[PDB]
């Protein structure tokens, strides 16, 4: 029981922490572009996607090999708890 | 010799009946299907195949136990009791204790009446349960054990799907199904982990041992 | 480790097979308790100094039937008693009672009911007593 | 001999809908080859001893299968509101609710589980044996839809109110500067707050309510009566 | 001297340890191999220790001249067999002259007749019945 | 021949057990449906013709194996092992040697392993290799699924499903590449050389 | 690299099949151990200088039966001892014991129990001794 | 001098190398080719080294004039055969006059009777059975 509680607490923790850096690197560049639009008046609502695509695709570029060694380290542990 | 084909049409359905109900084939078929639903595939890998691979591993394990029923072979029922001690001992080891006692008491309540003394756990030292109480309880105890393995197997992929559906909502791509992106990167988690040589490696070690 | 001064058996929820095997030393024969008469339980402080008289009283208070055939003591409950009626074509009942008296299987609690010089009688008792009486009665007429 | 087919086709009728409804017994985890062998073993193992008798016994089975599938519908409806508030479901106007249903099907299955399931199914023949015209007792059936919805709403009550305050505060942030595109700014953060808030009460609260909403054998007379 | 300190043995590792002082091998059945025993036992009179422990545990045993068979008491079977042309007093002298005569389980029957009643261990009953119907076939 | 029609119907239900597990039909049929799902099709072409092309390609490497058993094959004890020796020197090639020792315990030149010990490892090795070469096919289509979905998002049309646009492009990327014949050439050259 | 310069066999968890083959040169015959008697294990420092008394002592301490038929030493465990009753039609027991003494297959541990000049007797022992005495007594009546 | 240096050889490639110092080919069975041997051996008295190795590894062997068959100890079989019109003594004279007489596994039986007991390697017993039952039909 205490491992079923631990494995459920860690699956939600890894979802929270792996979707952390791409969702805070697409937030500062969602807010500072609009703060530039508060100084100079622009009425183009479809503007900060041009930076949001480069922000998410460059954050997923440097940490690409890092996600594989957190998914493999958690996926090998849960099967050892399953079988043994 | 077609006068015994009325019993051949019973023995050729009773021999797969024990296979699909009371042996280890039930655990292997549920785990193999639930890892197909864990990845998110519907047809492939074509469970006509998976009922053959699960039968090859179950006959691999059931080969020494069934062979003792052939080295041997009101009045014939006491002869078949001596021929069926290895199967009753295999069903005792892997069924549930709290569930066989339920099927034992409901049978005594069925046969003799409501004033029958309730059987407790302390019979287990010398008294052995019947073959009609182990056989329904073994199937449910392997449905419980295979669903227990399949939830653990299920968890990593759900971790992949909940980050993929989060980054497709960070970008403004809410009108985009995340299955078409996750299904490539859900397949690397099964080939870099070589789980086909890990589930079959572990499920054999639960029932037999090496060296 | 076991402090009581006297001698006796204390049963706490014994189940009538472990209880009668404890009486199977004062009785000098092994006891065989059936499957239906082993679901009943008994508890209390007992002592055995003439167990052939103690077994008769507890077989009426609990409800049981017993039989001693020279080697062991068989115990069934009361609802397992069976009946039979058989006919002897060429030996008498007084001839069959001399075979039971001379061998040592004659039981005065379950006698044979019938006319003294005829061929038919009526026997009833425990299932090991009836299945011996019927089998020896139909195995003496085929010899004679 | 030849009547055991009818005595196992009367057991199959009651057992089969329950199998159809429960999450650890459906077609997703039980393929066609071993499926029709288990339900004859269980139906022969629970027997206590004319076309519409198989329909009457099927109606008692659909009422029993909904009562045994009572605590998993609450967790699935919990997941569909947690997944709906963060986004990811407005393409029809899921992936999260299948995780809470798979979790509650294991945390119910460890402590007890199949013992109370076959205890309900074995007490069903002690009150609604066939050829006595049992019936699923209509006047409590009418509030069954309401009960699951109420349980799901109370269970999910934190995460909706927190995501509602995150929408009032982000709506207040746009009144100071309307050139923000605050519809899509909230869409990046509500899927992280709907995970962080449910992390604080996933462990201590949620495995209790599955053992609280579980239907037991003591309430069969309030749901099944006899006409005879 | 000697002995055996049993700690939760299973009545097959115990009666094999007694099978040195007893000068014969011991064959314990698998229905009497599920009972257990523990305690410090000293083998200085084994033929009376086996007789006492068979009654305290509830057991039946038999020694045919080559081994000692041990069953539990609920495996005792019985039969009644008819000899067409050989007396019981002659068959009982065949058992006395051979060495299979066991005074604990004798042959109950009329002394000059063909019918008797036998009961005991299953290896003793299935030998007496087979050697009696193979003595009606010889005559 | 009523003692032989049971020997014909059981053989006709035994070949669906063997062809679906112990031949190259396992690796063949999986990739045809993974490339069927990579484009975004559900019912095209069917489930029936994809087992037909894979069965016709499956006997291209099994008919040279089956002819050796037809010429060669209580005297039937050692008669069967050499009739299957042409099938068991093929099963050691495409299986894992450590895995077949796991089934043989629970050199190889002086003694070939048991025939019932390496057929499950052959099946698991072809399901694993089909999953590996099946992951590769998904990637080009996923790139042309993310490009059009981010070009329409460069515009203001966030309420527009890109499945109606990506499906033309995905099957010109499979026919300008000549995809269907290209996969079958590599599947044949992975077993039988030219 | 080998220890103290005496003679002996050191057994570190062998399985009664690799152990008796080390004794199979001091005994000048090959040793055949059954499949059921190869699951027991032994561990210690042993020393063979007359092995027919060591094998006699270990067959009682471990629980085993054995038979030397003139060309090998068969070893079974005690739970494989089988028995049979066979009746001789045209030859006596003393005229069969002279065949066993002159042929060297006579074993004093498991002799033939029966009346001295009759046709029926009783054998018991290892299965290679029982399958030889049954077939050699059946095939001698059809000879005479 | 000659000799063989075995490093984890498989007991079939070891006994094939002794088939030049022995003057006959050596035929090792399937179950006996699973054991292994290693070490430096010197072949100068091969028939004295073959018996010493066949008792330490656990093997049986039989040389019939054309080859040396080598089995292991678990493959030894036995039989009993009845002759109707020839005795044991002239059948032993057939084995001595032919050259198939093996003094390690002789025939056990009374000297002028019909029955005897054979036990040895399977290429020996399957010859003695077929040669004994084909002399009664010739006589």
């Amino acid at each position: 029981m205490d491992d079923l509680v631990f494995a459920g607490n860690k699956a939600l923790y890894l979802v929270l922490i792996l979707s952390g850096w791409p969702t805070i690197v697409a937030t500062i560049i969602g807010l500072l572009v609009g703060l530039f639009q508060t100084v100079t008046q622009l009425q183009e609502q479809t503007l900060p996607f041009g930076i949001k695509l480069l922000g998410v695709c460059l954050c997923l570029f440097l940490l690409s090999g890092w996600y594989g060694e957190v998914l493999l380290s958690y996926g090998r542990q849960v099967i050892f708890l399953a079988l043994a | 010799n077609d006068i015994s084909l009325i019993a051949l049409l019973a023995f050729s359905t009773l021999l797969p009946f024990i296979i699909a109900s009371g042996t280890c084939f039930v655990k292997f078929s549920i785990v193999f299907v639930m890892v197909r639903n864990a990845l998110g595939l519907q047809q492939i890998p074509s469970n006509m195949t998976l009922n053959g691979v699960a039968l090859l591993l179950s006959m691999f394990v059931m080969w020494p136990i069934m062979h003792d029923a052939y080295v041997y072979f009101s009045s014939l029922s006491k002869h078949v009791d001596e021929g069926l001690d290895g199967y009753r001992d295999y069903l005792i080891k892997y069924s549930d204790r709290e569930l066989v006692q339920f099927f034992e008491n409901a049978q005594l309540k069925r046969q003799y009446g409501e004033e029958t003394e309730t059987v407790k756990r302390d019979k287990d030292e010398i008294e052995k349960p019947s073959i009609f109480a182990l056989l329904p309880a073994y199937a449910l105890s392997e449905i419980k054990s295979a669903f227990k393995i399949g939830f653990y197997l299920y968890l990593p992929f759900v971790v992949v799907d909940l980050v993929v559906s989060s980054v497709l909502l960070a970008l403004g791509m809410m009108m985009m199904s995340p299955v078409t992106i996750s299904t490539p990167i859900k397949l690397v988690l099964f080939v870099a982990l070589d789980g086909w040589t890990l589930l079959s490696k572990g499920l054999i070690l639960q029932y037999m041992d090496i060296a | 480790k076991i402090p009581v001064t006297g001698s006796g058996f204390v049963a706490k929820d014994d189940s009538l097979r472990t209880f009668f095997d404890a009486m199977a030393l004062q009785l000098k024969e092994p006891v065989i308790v059936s499957k239906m008469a082993a679901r009943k339980k008994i508890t209390g402080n007992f002592e055995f100094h003439d167990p052939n008289a103690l077994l008769e009283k507890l077989s009426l208070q609990l409800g049981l039937i017993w039989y001693f055939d020279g080697q062991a003591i068989y115990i069934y409950d009361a609802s397992e008693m069976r009946n039979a009626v058989v006919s002897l074509r060429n030996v008498s009942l007084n001839e069959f009672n001399n075979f039971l008296k001379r061998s040592g299987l004659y039981n005065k609690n379950y006698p044979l009911r019938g006319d003294n010089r005829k061929g038919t009688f009526y026997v009833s008792g425990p299932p090991v007593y009836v299945d011996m009486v019927v089998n020896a009665a139909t195995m003496m007429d085929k010899q004679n | 001999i030849h009547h055991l087919v009818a005595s196992a086709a009367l057991g199959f009728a009651r057992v089969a809908p329950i199998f159809f409804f429960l999450p650890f017994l459906n077609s997703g985890v039980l393929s066609g080859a071993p499926r029709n062998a288990i339900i004859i073993l269980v139906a022969l193992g629970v027997w206590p001893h004319m076309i519409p008798l198989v329909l009457q016994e099927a109606a008692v089975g659909v009422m029993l299968g909904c009562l045994l599938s009572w605590p998993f519908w609450v967790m699935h409806a919990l997941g569909c509101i947690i997944d709906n508030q963060r986004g990811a479901t407005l393409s029809s106007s899921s992936e999260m609710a299948n995780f809470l249903n798979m979790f509650a099907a294991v945390v119910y299955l460890q402590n007890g589980g199949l013992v109370t399931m076959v205890d309900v199914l074995n007490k069903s023949y002690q009150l609604c044996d066939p050829m006595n015209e049992c019936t699923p007792s209509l006047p409590p059936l009418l509030t069954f839809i309401n009960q699951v919805a109420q349980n799901a709403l109370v269970l999910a009550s934190p995460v909706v109110l927190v995501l509602l305050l995150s929408e009032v505060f982000l709506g207040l942030l746009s009144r100071f500067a309307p050139q923000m595109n605050a519809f899509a700014i909230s869409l990046t953060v509500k899927s992280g707050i709907a995970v962080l808030i449910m992390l604080l009460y996933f462990s201590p609260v949620l495995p209790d309510n599955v053992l609280r909403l579980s239907f037991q054998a003591t309430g069969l007379s309030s749901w099944f009566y006899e006409r005879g």
Side-chain angles (χ1 to χ4, degrees), chain D residues 86-94 96-103:
Chain D
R86 70 185 194 88
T89 46
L90 320 179
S91 89
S92 46
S93 45
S94 177
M96 183 47 195
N98 215 346
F99 163 67
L100 288 168
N101 179 267
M102 197 82 53
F103 180 74

Side-chain angles (χ1 to χ4, degrees), chain B residues 76-91:
Chain B
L76 292 164
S77 180
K78 75 154 170 224
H79 305 172
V80 77
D81 209 316
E82 196 273 348
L84 286 198
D85 300 68
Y87 191 56
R88 184 176 289 172
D89 210 317
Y90 155 76
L91 292 166

Side-chain angles (χ1 to χ4, degrees), chain C residues 16-24 27 29-38 55 64-69 71-77 80 126-128:
Chain C
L16 272 196
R17 191 203 300 271
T18 76
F19 173 71
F20 276 121
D21 295 359
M23 216 192 294
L27 302 163
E29 306 306 312
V31 189
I32 304 175
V33 190
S34 88
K35 193 248 185 184
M36 201 201 282
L55 183 47
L64 295 174
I65 45 182
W66 66 289
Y67 182 58
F68 165 66
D69 66 323
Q71 292 96 351
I73 299 177
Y74 299 86
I75 287 175
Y76 309 90
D77 68 346
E80 281 181 316
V128 78

Side-chain angles (χ1 to χ4, degrees), chain B residues 75-189:
Chain B
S75 281
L76 292 164
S77 180
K78 75 154 170 224
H79 305 172
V80 77
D81 209 316
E82 196 273 348
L84 286 198
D85 300 68
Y87 191 56
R88 184 176 289 172
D89 210 317
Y90 155 76
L91 292 166
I92 282 183
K93 183 176 173 65
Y94 297 100
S95 86
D96 263 349
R97 177 39 59 173
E98 63 184 290
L99 186 63
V100 300
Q101 194 197 346
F102 191 85
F103 279 106
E104 262 281 289
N105 308 350
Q107 216 271 349
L108 274 194
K109 281 267 307 163
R110 172 201 303 170
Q111 172 179 180
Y112 297 107
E114 51 184 341
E115 313 282 90
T116 308
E117 277 312 279
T118 319
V119 177
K120 262 44 184 183
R121 187 272 179 191
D122 51 308
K123 57 149 192 304
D124 70 280
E125 295 62 27
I126 177 61
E127 171 67 341
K128 228 180 180 179
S130 65
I131 209 67
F132 283 154
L134 300 169
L135 205 47
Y138 177 72
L140 261 71
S141 316
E142 300 193 317
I143 291 180
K144 183 261 289 181
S145 196
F147 196 84
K148 167 164 286 301
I149 309 178
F151 169 64
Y152 282 130
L153 262 296
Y154 204 77
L155 284 164
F157 305 135
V158 189
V159 180
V160 173
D161 302 348
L162 276 175
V163 71
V164 163
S165 297
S166 177
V167 289
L168 295 180
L169 289 191
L171 306 164
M173 299 176 56
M174 69 167 309
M175 283 295 304
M176 170 78 186
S177 188
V179 172
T180 52
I181 303 183
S182 75
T183 313
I185 73 170
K186 212 192 298 184
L187 275 166
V188 191
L189 266 297

Side-chain angles (χ1 to χ4, degrees), chain B residues 60-61 94 201 203-211:
Chain B
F60 179 76
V61 185
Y94 297 100
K201 197 76 65 68
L203 285 160
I204 290 296
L205 286 171
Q206 291 181 1
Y207 292 89
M208 199 71 190
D209 74 279
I210 68 184

Side-chain angles (χ1 to χ4, degrees), chain C residues 2-142:
Chain C
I2 320 170
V4 189
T5 301
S7 90
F9 185 76
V10 168
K12 304 195 194 70
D13 210 77
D14 273 16
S15 89
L16 272 196
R17 191 203 300 271
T18 76
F19 173 71
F20 276 121
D21 295 359
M23 216 192 294
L25 189 49
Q26 288 282 320
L27 302 163
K28 295 174 175 64
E29 306 306 312
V31 189
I32 304 175
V33 190
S34 88
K35 193 248 185 184
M36 201 201 282
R39 307 200 193 116
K40 320 185 163 185
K41 302 160 185 318
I42 183 163
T43 174
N45 203 321
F46 299 95
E47 54 97 17
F48 323 114
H49 84 286
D50 55 340
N52 283 274
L54 197 145
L55 183 47
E56 180 80 21
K57 185 192 295 170
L58 284 183
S59 50
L60 288 178
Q61 309 205 75
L62 268 66
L64 295 174
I65 45 182
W66 66 289
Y67 182 58
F68 165 66
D69 66 323
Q71 292 96 351
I73 299 177
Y74 299 86
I75 287 175
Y76 309 90
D77 68 346
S79 159
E80 281 181 316
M81 169 179 276
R82 53 182 289 166
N83 318 303
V85 50
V86 284
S87 67
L88 303 172
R89 308 203 311 274
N90 44 5
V91 295
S92 67
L93 177 63
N94 197 270
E95 212 176 357
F96 199 69
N97 288 18
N98 283 28
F99 165 70
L100 299 188
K101 280 173 193 291
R102 198 198 292 265
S103 67
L105 305 165
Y106 167 70
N107 192 282
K108 63 169 291 289
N109 282 307
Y110 310 103
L112 288 82
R113 305 286 178 188
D115 199 4
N116 219 15
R117 32 173 77 91
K118 289 293 178 67
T120 45
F121 54 88
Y122 175 80
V123 60
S124 87
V128 78
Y129 176 65
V130 181
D131 295 347
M132 172 258 300
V133 162
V134 172
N135 269 39
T138 77
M139 271 188 180
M140 276 183 176
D141 295 7
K142 218 166 297 177

